[PDB]
Amino acid sequence: AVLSFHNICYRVKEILSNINGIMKPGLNAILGPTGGGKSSLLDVLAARKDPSGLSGDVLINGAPRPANFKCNSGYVVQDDVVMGTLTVRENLQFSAALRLATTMTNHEKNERINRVIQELGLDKVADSKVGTQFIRGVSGGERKRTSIGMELITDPSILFLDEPTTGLDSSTANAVLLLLKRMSKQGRTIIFSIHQPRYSIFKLFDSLTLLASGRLMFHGPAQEALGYFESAGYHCEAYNNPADFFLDIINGDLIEKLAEIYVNSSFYKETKAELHQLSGYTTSFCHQLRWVSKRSFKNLLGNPQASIAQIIVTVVLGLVIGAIYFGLKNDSTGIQNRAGVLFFLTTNQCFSSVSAVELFVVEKKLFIHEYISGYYRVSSYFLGKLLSDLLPMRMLPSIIFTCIVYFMLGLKPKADAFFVMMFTLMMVAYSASSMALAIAAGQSVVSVATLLMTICFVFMMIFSGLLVNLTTIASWLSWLQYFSIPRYGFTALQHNEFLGQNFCPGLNATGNNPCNYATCTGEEYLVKQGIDLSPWGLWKNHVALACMIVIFLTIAYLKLLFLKKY
Amino acid sequence: AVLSFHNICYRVKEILSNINGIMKPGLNAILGPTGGGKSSLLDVLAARKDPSGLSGDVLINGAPRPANFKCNSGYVVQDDVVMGTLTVRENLQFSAALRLATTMTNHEKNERINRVIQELGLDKVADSKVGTQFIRGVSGGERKRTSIGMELITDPSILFLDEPTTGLDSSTANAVLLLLKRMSKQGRTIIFSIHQPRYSIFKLFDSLTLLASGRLMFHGPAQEALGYFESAGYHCEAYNNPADFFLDIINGDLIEKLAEIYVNSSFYKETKAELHQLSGYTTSFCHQLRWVSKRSFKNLLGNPQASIAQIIVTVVLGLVIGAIYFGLKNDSTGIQNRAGVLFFLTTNQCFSSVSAVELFVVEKKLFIHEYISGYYRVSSYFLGKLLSDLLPMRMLPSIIFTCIVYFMLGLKPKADAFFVMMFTLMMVAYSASSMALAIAAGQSVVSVATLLMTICFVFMMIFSGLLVNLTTIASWLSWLQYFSIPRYGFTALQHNEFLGQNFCPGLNATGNNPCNYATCTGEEYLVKQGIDLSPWGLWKNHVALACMIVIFLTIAYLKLLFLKKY
Numbered sequence A, B: 001a002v003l004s005f006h007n008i009c010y011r012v013k014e015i016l017s018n019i020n021g022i023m024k025p026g027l028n029a030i031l032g033p034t035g036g037g038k039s040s041l042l043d044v045l046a047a048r049k050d051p052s053g054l055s056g057d058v059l060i061n062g063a064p065r066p067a068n069f070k071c072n073s074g075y076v077v078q079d080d081v082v083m084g085t086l087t088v089r090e091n092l093q094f095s096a097a098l099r100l101a102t103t104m105t106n107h108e109k110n111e112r113i114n115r116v117i118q119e120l121g122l123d124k125v126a127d128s129k130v131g132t133q134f135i136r137g138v139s140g141g142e143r144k145r146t147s148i149g150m151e152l153i154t155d156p157s158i159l160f161l162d163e164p165t166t167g168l169d170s171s172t173a174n175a176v177l178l179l180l181k182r183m184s185k186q187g188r189t190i191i192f193s194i195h196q197p198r199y200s201i202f203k204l205f206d207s208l209t210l211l212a213s214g215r216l217m218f219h220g221p222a223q224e225a226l227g228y229f230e231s232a233g234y235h236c237e238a239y240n241n242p243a244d245f246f247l248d249i250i251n252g253d254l255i256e257k258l259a260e261i262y263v264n265s266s267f268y269k270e271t272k273a274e275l276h277q278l279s280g281y282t283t284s285f286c287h288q289l290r291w292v293s294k295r296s297f298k299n300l301l302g303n304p305q306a307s308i309a310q311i312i313v314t315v316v317l318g319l320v321i322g323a324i325y326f327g328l329k330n331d332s333t334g335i336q337n338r339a340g341v342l343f344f345l346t347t348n349q350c351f352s353s354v355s356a357v358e359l360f361v362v363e364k365k366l367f368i369h370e371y372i373s374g375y376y377r378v379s380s381y382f383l384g385k386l387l388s389d390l391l392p393m394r395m396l397p398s399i400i401f402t403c404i405v406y407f408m409l410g411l412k413p414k415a416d417a418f419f420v421m422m423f424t425l426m427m428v429a430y431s432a433s434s435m436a437l438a439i440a441a442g443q444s445v446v447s448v449a450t451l452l453m454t455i456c457f458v459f460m461m462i463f464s465g466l467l468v469n470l471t472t473i474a475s476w477l478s479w480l481q482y483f484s485i486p487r488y489g490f491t492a493l494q495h496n497e498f499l500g501q502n503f504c505p506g507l508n509a510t511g512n513n514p515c516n517y518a519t520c521t522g523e524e525y526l527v528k529q530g531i532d533l534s535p536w537g538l539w540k541n542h543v544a545l546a547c548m549i550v551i552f553l554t555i556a557y558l559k560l561l562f563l564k565k566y
């Protein structure tokens, strides 16, 4: 399969104006400065831009590009987006299970995971972890190689590479770039956009397309690239690199004058002659959930640097709160002391789950790459990570928390009340995290994603029945009490706590008491807060919290589905 | 003045082992890969490394290097550390006032601010703001030029440049690098370490010193640099750049073998022959405070993007708190409602001043550069920014705040009580900011500087007399209540608030009342919290808060003074 393209007009201002060229099933290249359409022409051929501003036609071996061209052709993006906290054997296994297991069996597809493991040369680092900025692993020259084989699993006719030697320590650059020539003998069309090649790959170019400032300068093979400028008016004599010279006419030793002789050159008049002649998901849903979770669950425990940091800070906080209110009694300072701690637990769960914004913003460029390549639907990436990084990461600081703080305090020695506290602590922890998930998904920078959290969760802990006595704010702004997660947690934690206690030893304030403004018995404390004493008045909050989850979850699912991924 | 150095042995592993060379009062260069001692040799000649691991002698024109060599010789660091939110006319004025005004007058030194303004060519952008990532200004080619003239004010014999063309859009690279040759005609010795020169400056090198992997490869002028390798065993024929070839022997088309012929070459045997022959603050304190503040105060209002963002979020928070507790009455919900708001004000000041960690961590590399160059003492940089970015930035969210929230609430309609609230709100705001200043000064990354804040200020708002009733925690951990800023704010805000109110209409609970556990009169509310009713018991907190400032300020002054600035 060969690629070709004609009269490509791309507008955002036209960033890619008058570009036409033909590829070969060999090893091609897109050179030039990065300010022009160098990166832009590669995404056009990869169908990675949006097709709105495009005008021309990318004709693949005479056929027009179908909609499943993107699932047939890999695209190694610039930065290493491989899963760093996994092993390269499993890292090739992740893509292999998401694009092949429809009709072939398991051990059938096990062949091509090993068949590609020595053509890359990855057998010496096959069973090692990759390597991140938080951990050490395989060297950086083979972080790029496992990116290449990851899209080599599905059988490619075309293979793009966005700048595959940016930050790769050029002593290691030749072996991967010789390896792309070795793949090209079988028929794999390779169209990369290398960044400042010195000389070593420049002898091994089957074609090249230099592009600068949105104007097509030169397209032709590298052996006849030297013989262009020496009869075109631009002398590159000895002690001058040829791959470095070609951009010096743009540097000024005119912005369109460097390319207008290419219209009247001996390349474009016959390249058009071919172009004027040539112009005449896949895997099941339960399997897609089973693999994005298994990748994410292995990524969770594989880097337990911040996951278990949340565990040990939940243990010692529940020990400190346990040491402070150790054996809190039913004296005068019962309502002041046990409504205080229940305020702290719900607002901490509201505030410790600001870290959930760092969920869809680390792997955002990974998700944009893996959705558009066809690994999974958005409904699989979204649901798969909630079962992996949201359920067994917010459930833990509610049952590790409440087993320590409850009996060390002596709140209410029942068996359901220990459970309707553990349930409502994980109900605010799922609700507040999914709220922080909502207004931070589909974003790249967590500057405003944390700025919009920390000034909004203080617009909620005000309206939470401790600092305010909610039934005393006048009604024209007291409607805001319903739009606040910690009110439902605090009230549900108060309703199962102040129901049998009387904070008043030496008397009884059940039915007969003079000298009011007392609040001796516990239910009178709740009616001053306006919390309903009915048993529905506990579970009124949870069905308001469960609706708070699902409302705030589907806006997060929308923001990933309605995200511009081009 | 000419520089020279002999047998330079630098250990951290020896990063700079056997390097010796001579400079010329011309234009020198330090080439090679960045992994070796390329950047390391420049800091040695600039006396920018620490002199601990150094063994050899940097001999300047036969004299040894004095301790005031660093104030005599500029050093343009790699990144642009000029003040971006100032005008280049004032940007040259800042250095001019800090190193010249001891004996000459003001308008005398005004000559050399203009005398250097056209040799750089900065007259067209003299009265414009420089340019940052938050604002636009002068182009990036002249951001580097104002860095050069900023150390040209004091009369230099020697002038270093750490990589002066890293990210400078090489079409603009020649004019600044031709300008360094134009400065070299007067006698200014220029020793830079340029990064990958292509050819254009390579013809204009008065000397060069290539260095790779801590082993001295070649030192000699560029005209006799070509004639080295063609009789040394390494052929660089036509269509090969000479400045790019010299590192290909390290790339492998042996780590010490490339330099051992330089020991038996026709350069080192006579360079040693000179070396074996040659081996035979300033400005007043009130003026230094007056200029670092004027720079910082102009940097504050010159970029009012986040400064006035704190103002408008203080106004609308004080309006929202004003709208919530609008006219709070003396009913049963008086203690629940007005001790709640006073908890919120002190903890917000404790928590809104987490942004004070972004004070000595933005200009840290600026401070390291400007202290070591001799602009000011550490006591001037530290005190100058407190009078600029700490006084009129935390005073504003305590008098803009308390004028709105006080009379809209109706707290206590005195005239001192409005002031002993405004005083104690700015006492926590200065204390908590200076605590956040303390454990974040002298650091580069605000990851742990915010991580150690947000988990410590919740170890303080627990012990603040609202969630806990401090006199009920057993004494073996209740000693922790003194190590907490918001307890002193909340208590001082409570002591001036609960002193005449009785929250109990229809009765009086002054001296005669049955049916206790009432808390009807306001002073009985304070004695349950253990807050002393004596008038010293208000100001007990402020003299504990003023000692909290000075203790937490001098650890910040220590961390800048005892900071490794090499």
Ligand SMILES: O=C1c2c(O)ccc(O)c2C(=O)c2c(NCCNCCO)ccc(NCCNCCO)c21
Residues within 6 Å of the ligand: A313, A314, A317, A344, A347, A348, A351, A352, A354, A454, A455, A458, B347, B348, B351, B352, B454, B455, B458
């Ligand atoms: O925990 C709180 C918090 C709280 O427990 C009770 C009241 C609070 O106001 C907070 C809180 O504010 C908080 C964080 N916010 C800092 C910015 N607040 C500025 C308000 O204008 C930022 C982070 C944060 N918690 C991180 C705790 N780490 C896990 C241990 O539970 C908090």
Ligand SMILES: CC(C)CCC[C@@H](C)[C@H]1CC[C@H]2[C@@H]3CC=C4C[C@@H](O)CC[C@]4(C)[C@H]3CC[C@]12C
Residues within 6 Å of the ligand: A482, A483, A484, A540, A543, A544, A547, A548, A551
């Ligand atoms: C997208 C965002 C802004 C929507 C906010 C979600 C909140 C405000 C919505 C979603 C579900 C709603 C709740 C669902 C049903 C109940 C139970 C009823 O007995 C009291 C009201 C209450 C509790 C509703 C209040 C408003 C509510 C909590």
Ligand SMILES: CC(C)CCC[C@@H](C)[C@H]1CC[C@H]2[C@@H]3CC=C4C[C@@H](O)CC[C@]4(C)[C@H]3CC[C@]12C
Residues within 6 Å of the ligand: B482, B483, B484, B540, B543, B544, B547, B548, B551
């Ligand atoms: C470096 C850090 C850890 C030191 C912490 C500072 C705090 C804990 C120190 C510094 C100054 C000290 C205060 C100064 C004097 C008083 C007034 C006295 O009537 C009560 C104790 C009290 C209030 C001290 C308590 C402890 C104190 C507040």
